[PDB]
Amino acid sequence: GAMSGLADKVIWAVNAGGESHVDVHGIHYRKDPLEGRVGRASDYGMKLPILRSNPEDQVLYQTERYNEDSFGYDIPIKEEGEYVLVLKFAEVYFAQSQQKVFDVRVNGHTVVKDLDIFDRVGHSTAHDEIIPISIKKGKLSVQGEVSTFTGKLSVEFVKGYYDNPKVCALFIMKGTADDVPMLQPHPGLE
Numbered sequence: 001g002a003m004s005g006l007a008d009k010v011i012w013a014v015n016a017g018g019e020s021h022v023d024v025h026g027i028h029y030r031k032d033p034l035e036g037r038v039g040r041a042s043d044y045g046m047k048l049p050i051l052r053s054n055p056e057d058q059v060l061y062q063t064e065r066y067n068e069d070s071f072g073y074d075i076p077i078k079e080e081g082e083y084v085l086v087l088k089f090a091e092v093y094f095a096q097s098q099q100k101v102f103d104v105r106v107n108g109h110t111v112v113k114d115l116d117i118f119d120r121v122g123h124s125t126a127h128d129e130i131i132p133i134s135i136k137k138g139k140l141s142v143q144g145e146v147s148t149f150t151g152k153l154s155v156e157f158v159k160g161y162y163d164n165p166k167v168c169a170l171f172i173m174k175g176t177a178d179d180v181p182m183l184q185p186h187p188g189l190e
């Protein structure tokens with residue numbers, strides 16, 4: 001079936017950990033394209049199913065891939081509008097707070113410099129960061145800083161305290177954050 005219209009705006013998505021997956025809404029991740037761009041999901045930490053995610057979008061929002069340090073993703077763009085970078089981060093090993101902090105940049109712009117997945121949600125579960133963007137005339141505007149766009153969007157995260165962001169669920173869509181379906185809890189019988 002097909003009702004939602006999210007897949008209609010998708011343009012590029014990557015979940016470091018699994019291998020080519022399509023979330024319910026219809027958001028597909030393209031197999032390890034930056035981790036040596038060669039190999040297959042090691043699926044070593046497939047265990048511990050994320051709670052805030054349905055079984056299918058679970059393996060996606062979950063799974064884990066390890067590179068080495070300062071991992072970098074490339075998102076070639078050729079259109080404008082409101083680009084919304086949504087990503088699901090999960091797991092990090094060791095139950096500690098304000099210690100395992102990392103850095104996250106968009107097209108070279110630090111938006112979350114203190115990514116402590118644990119302190120953020122707590123238990124494993126699923127973590128999510130929403131970063132709306134505005135590209136016009138070929139230029140880029142991140143939050144409150146202006147910088148022209150050049151070839152592609154680059155999400156680079158730098159090491160903070162060993163073990164770079166374990167689980168990565170990169171998901172980039174185009175045109176707006178409002179599209180992102182969100183059904184508020186409903187009681188009774190549907």
Ligand SMILES: OC[C@H]1O[C@H](O[C@@H]2[C@@H](O)[C@@H](O)O[C@H](CO)[C@H]2O)[C@H](O)[C@@H](O)[C@@H]1O
Nearest residue numbers: 044045064065066067093162163164166
């Ligand atoms: O190859 C499996 C995992 O290796 C690394 O994790 C290490 C862990 O297994 C243990 O031995 O402790 C060390 C020190 O912190 C960890 O580095 C990778 O970080 C992980 O991504 C792999 O799945």
